Symmetry: C2
Subunit: 163 residues, 2 copies
């Protein structure tokens, strides 16, 4: 079936250190579901990691996981990383995005108030890089405020002017 | 007292997510002692964090901690980050070094075999970025092999040609 006469949305790269596959994996599949609603989620690897037996060394391909992550992260039109408890993938994904990434939204939850790493917090430039606070009960809101200041017509358009 | 008629060594930036101040803090002060022997350690903030009451929010300056870390990390002639258990500062320090850093040595311990993050491992380019394995009983060796392939005359020089 030919695609609708509409343009393609944007892409979102949600980072969320895996190292195994736990509740963060479940929260990731949900968070990934919202980002997947806004546009295309490139970090499909994440969240889609619950399937098959988990355990890092578990079949998967750490190199293939990162390889696609670095390439897609580079193909990401929009990037947001979840943060709360210590995380190497989140720190690397946020640091790499700081330099190779452009639009970077970071999230830290106060419910645990684990004080976001001083590095991610200090990186706070408020110039594409921002550390917003949130909780599973309002994560969608954090993205809603940021995206509301963003997705204006990309969200939907009844008219489709010639390219 | 005027400095000896010798040139200045190199500088080393040892990264080691703090978030509090624990054994990693003690292992950091020691590791920092070896790097401090090779040249100048810019991450003086780390390790030197045991003093005064710890607790992140504890007096210190998360922004000042990162601020100096980012600037010094940029002034680092050599950079090595410790890795083993999940860490946001290590992930960010390694990611930022991947892009802004140049010489980057990463360390992961097999004793716990926590499988280094797929991102740090996948970043394994072996072109300044390398993930070496080690244990508190041989950490100095990891640095000794890397530095042995490095600090040749900078270690010491009886002659001091004009410059």
């Amino acid at each position: 079936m030919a695609a609708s006469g509409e343009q393609a949305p944007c892409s979102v790269y949600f980072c969320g250190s895996i190292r195994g596959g736990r509740e963060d994996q479940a929260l990731y599949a949900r968070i990934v579901s919202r980002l997947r609603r806004y546009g295309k989620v490139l970090t499909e690897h994440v969240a889609d990691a619950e399937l098959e037996p988990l355990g890092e060394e578990a079949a998967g391909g750490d190199q293939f996981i990162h390889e696609q992550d670095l390439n897609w992260l580079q193909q990401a039109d929009v990037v947001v990383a979840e943060v709360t408890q210590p995380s190497l993938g989140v720190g690397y994904e946020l640091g790499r995005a700081v330099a190779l990434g452009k639009p970077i939204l970071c999230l830290f939850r106060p419910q645990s108030g684990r004080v976001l790493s001083a590095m991610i917090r200090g990186a706070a430039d408020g110039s594409r890089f921002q550390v917003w606070d949130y909780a599973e009960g309002e994560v969608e809101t954090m993205l809603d405020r940021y995206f509301e200041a963003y997705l204006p017509q990309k969200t939907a358009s009844s008219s489709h002017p010639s390219a």
